[PDB]
């Protein structure tokens, strides 16, 4: 488990060093965007979080593409990562499923949280939002999912 080094934490697997710097560059930036840089506007503070969410998402996409896509590491490296909280087991378990392949997060597919219905507009393909932009003619009001800043999360866009 623990992100902290501690004695219980089973020492690294092998290929680790080859990736180690790519990891650390994300890591510093988290320490960077958690820094409490004040703003009076709600719109901002939520933006601030939109970083942390984004980074976390990239790190996981990276480890994921290494292990599954190109198979450039070994099962024990990978599983050691995931044990150390380097990447989301779960989220990656979505990226393996058919449609979700490019998914945001796991709030953005929650059915139960949203007032009605489901699934932030975050998911719908642009190919349709554009259709209501056709008929109605207002272009398209959507830009950022309040939770993330997804824009066309669905795996076509």
């Amino acid at each position: 488990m623990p992100r902290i080094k501690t004695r219980r934490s089973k020492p690294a697997p092998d290929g680790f060093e080859k990736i180690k710097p790519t990891l650390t560059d994300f890591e510093i930036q988290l320490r960077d965007a958690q820094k409490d840089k004040s703003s009076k506007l709600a719109a901002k503070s939520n933006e601030q979080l939109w970083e942390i969410m984004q980074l976390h998402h990239q790190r996981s996409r990276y480890i994921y593409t290494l292990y599954y896509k190109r198979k450039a590491i070994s099962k024990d490296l990978y599983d050691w990562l995931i044990k150390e909280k380097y990447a989301d087991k779960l989220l990656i378990a979505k990226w393996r499923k058919t449609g979700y392949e490019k998914l945001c997060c796991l709030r953005c597919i929650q059915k139960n949280e949203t007032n009605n219905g489901s699934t932030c507009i975050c998911r719908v393909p642009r190919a349709q939002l554009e259709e209501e932009a056709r008929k109605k003619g207002t272009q398209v009001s959507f830009h950022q999912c309040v939770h993330c800043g997804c824009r066309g999360c669905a795996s076509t866009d």
Binding site: R8, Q34, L41, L49, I52, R107
Partner: protein, 68 residues
Amino acid sequence: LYTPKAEMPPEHLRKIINTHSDMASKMYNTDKKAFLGALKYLPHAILKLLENMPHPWEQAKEVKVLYH
């Protein structure tokens, strides 16, 4: 329906509290009321915290928190 909960990184939490720490704005006048609400539930939290103390032989324990 019922998907389960979605676990999220620890950061998102730290950023949250590390902002609402400084409150002087207007936009917190909801959160301000929110705070008074949780005052009812605090002693609960205490219990559910302090029964997980880490015990002499573990160095650092890691827990699962459920936050507002």
